[PDB]
Amino acid sequence: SSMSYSWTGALITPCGPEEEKLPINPLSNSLLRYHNKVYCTTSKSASQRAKKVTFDRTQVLDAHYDSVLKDIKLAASKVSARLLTLQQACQLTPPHSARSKYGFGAKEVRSLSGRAVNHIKSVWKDLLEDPQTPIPTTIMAKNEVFCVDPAKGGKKPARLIVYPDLGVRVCEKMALYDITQKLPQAVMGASYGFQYSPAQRVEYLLKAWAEKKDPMGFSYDTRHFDSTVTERDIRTEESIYQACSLPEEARTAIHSLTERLYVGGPMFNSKGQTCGYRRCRASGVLTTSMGNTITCYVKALAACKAAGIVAPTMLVCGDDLIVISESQGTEEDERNLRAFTEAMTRYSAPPGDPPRPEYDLELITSCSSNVSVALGPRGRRRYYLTRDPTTPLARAAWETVRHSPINSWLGNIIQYAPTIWVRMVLMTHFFSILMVQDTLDQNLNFEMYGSVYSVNPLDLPAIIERLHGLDAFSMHTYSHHELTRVASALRKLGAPPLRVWKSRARAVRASLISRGGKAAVCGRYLFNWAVKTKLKLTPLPEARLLDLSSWFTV
Ligand SMILES: [Mn+2]
Ligand SMILES: [Mn+2]
């Protein structure tokens, strides 16, 4: 039926300047050596991406899909959602959000400037009055950093980002922001993945695994998910939104945004030239995350019915899915997963990599992470969330005139504090850098799900205990998979091996302790793994007074 995109031949041009690596990387050339391997995706590869995601979608639904969709609409109907005032929506605009073609930017929006408020007022009226004229969007290449993979062609091409003007983005929040805060939990409950901290995610997956008599689990991820979303998927998303109790003015704007923006529209490059036409999800609209997660859930739950998955417990984040279910024996499990994949392919969610049943929790990777196991000194098994450290380490080494990688370091330290690579490598490097700079007490930003939280490095012990438990400071015996992966990624990036990081951490620890105060607490808690004679760590009173509850929610 419909093509995901069509193209005029105009270039996807850069949105301003694209940074050069410099001949010296002074903050990370003591972390790793192979800086040649660290690269940033740019508009230069945007055309290769465009080719890869342009294809004809043919979508065939069935009675399982219809039954699931009915249950989801009924679940939606329990939600009451309100319009945000124009001013409320204005003040949720991030401080550096891309400015408007109409001579104002995020600063004016956040301060309720007269010019910006009046312009947005007219954008909203036009939404209530015109349910049809397509809204123009800008297309740009995502700039993000990876390590070269020769096994996969060297450098990945940049993702495509598609977004409307700042005035429209404010209007989207007026109509749909409150729905984004309520709909996913309402239709998915515990299956909604973007409500869990790493430790809570682990706990959820362990609980599901344990309650199967004979558990089987698998992961599923869709190839180029946004381009596989059909105009009919998007209209079905509106009908799920419309299932909630909404004032009529919201219903009118929701429909108008769907027909004029969400289902498709023309795309212009940063130079204003017409560039193509979109008939799929625009990654950049307010409903991208919620839409992906709900549509993924509809298709996946229906495909579970198609395939005969027994007693499925799901975890869905965007287009990432884990299903833990009752095994029917490996032979039927293999067939069922093929049925699952075939059904998802009919629903227009074809697989990136073919899914495979697994019977060991460590071997299932979803949303770029997996559960692993370490011991204490106790022999007591402790489970925690980890991931391949390759991309975390590459981003740790991106340094330009415009970009400092230190927030990146801190983010990984916070999210993956129990891991051996954070504890021995990133933590060691982080405190070493900040000590030599004498900036240990200068706050840094932790960035997660579009929010920024101010963090003082010297509070990391309390933050980590609050998020991960004191066990995060005493994991002893890591798993074979995890040791292999971490050693391999350090070799791949030219970083010192773990034994060298141990020697460095002994020195960092001694320096931290010698400074007394909070710094000494960092040394004793975060680097207890480094010394032969372990100190007995006790609960930190400050951790009880931390409300980190919004850090890993939307
Ligand atoms: Mn995907
Ligand atoms: Mn994915």
Q: What is the DSSP string of 252-267?
A: HHHHHHIIIIIS-EEE
Query: Is position 352 within any domain?
Result: no
How is residue 258 written in tokens? 């769907």
Give the distance (Å) from ligand 1 centre to CA of residue 224: 5
Closest CA to 319 of 278, 347, 358, 357: 347
Given 241, 273, 290, which residue is the final one in a domain?
A: 290
Name 317's bridge partners. Answer: 320
Identify whether the C-beta of residue 198 lies closer than 8 Å to the C-beta of residue 552: yes
Closest CA to 314 of 299, 325, 302, 330: 325
Q: Any idea which ligand is nearest the CA of 368?
A: 2
Q: Any idea which ligand is nearest the CA of 349?
A: 1
Query: Is position 455 within any domain?
Result: yes
Give the distance (Å) from ligand 2 centre to CA of residue 222: 7
Does residue 23 come out as left (phi exceeding 0), alpha (psi in the -120 to 50 range) or beta?
Answer: alpha
Closest CA to 37 of 48, 25, 49, 47: 25
Is 214 annotated as ligand-binding?
A: no
Q: Any idea which ligand is nearest the CA of 227?
A: 1
Can you list the positions of beta strands (E) in 14-59? 38-40, 56-57
Q: Any idea which ligand is nearest the CA of 223?
A: 1
DSSP secondary structure letter of residue 351:
B
Residue with tokens 């979803």: 366
Q: Any idea which ligand is nearest the CA of 318?
A: 2
Is 547 annotated as ligand-binding?
A: no
Identify whether the C-beta of residue 219 lies closer than 8 Å to the C-beta of residue 363: no
Residues 239 and 90 in one domain: yes
Residues 508 and 405 in one domain: yes
Question: Domain range for residue 521?
Answer: 370-544
Query: Is position 218 within any domain?
Result: yes
Identify whether the C-beta of residue 260 lies closer than 8 Å to the C-beta of residue 202: no
Query: Is position 76 within any domain?
Result: yes
Residues near ligand 2 ion, CB 5 Å cutoff:
221, 319-320
Give the distance (Å) from ligand 1 centre to CA of residue 223: 5
> Which residues, other chains included, contact 516 with Cβ-Cβ below 8 Å and sequence gap of 6+?
none
Name the burial class of residue 260, with classes exposed (0-12), middle (13-18) and buried (19+) by CB atoms within 10 angstroms of its CB.
Answer: buried
User: What is the helix, strand, coil percentage profile of the chain, to 5?
Assistant: 50, 15, 35
Query: Is position 295 within any domain?
Result: no
Give the distance (Å) from ligand 1 centre to CA of residue 239: 24
Give the distance (Å) from ligand 2 centre to CA of residue 81: 29
Is 221 annotated as ligand-binding?
A: yes
Q: At what resolution in Å was this solved?
A: 2.2
Given 255, 290, 325, which residue is the final one in a domain?
A: 290
Rounded alpha-carbon distances, angstroms, from residue 313 to 189, 205, 213, 241: 11, 9, 13, 24
Query: What's the one-letter identity of residue 133?
Result: T
Residues 280 and 375 in one domain: no
Residues 132 and 224 in one domain: yes
Residue with tokens 């192979």: 34
Q: Give the β-pairing of 320-326 and 310-317.
A: antiparallel
DSSP secondary structure letter of residue 372:
E
- Number of domain units in the chain: 2
Identify whether the C-beta of residue 48 lies closer than 8 Å to the C-beta of residue 282: no
Residues 282 and 156 in one domain: yes
d(CA 420, CA 386) in angstroms, rounded, equals: 9
> Which residues, other chains included, contact 151 with Cβ-Cβ below 8 Å and sequence gap of 6+?
none
Residues 286 and 408 in one domain: no
Structural biology method used: X-ray
Query: Is position 105 within any domain?
Result: yes
Query: Is position 64 within any domain?
Result: yes
Residues 66 and 187 in one domain: yes
Give the distance (Å) from ligand 1 centre to CA of residue 221: 5
Q: Is residue 219 classed as helix, strand or coil in its secondary structure?
A: strand
Query: Is position 506 within any domain?
Result: yes
Given 290, 314, 343, which residue is the final one in a domain?
A: 290
How is residue 346 written in tokens? 């009919």
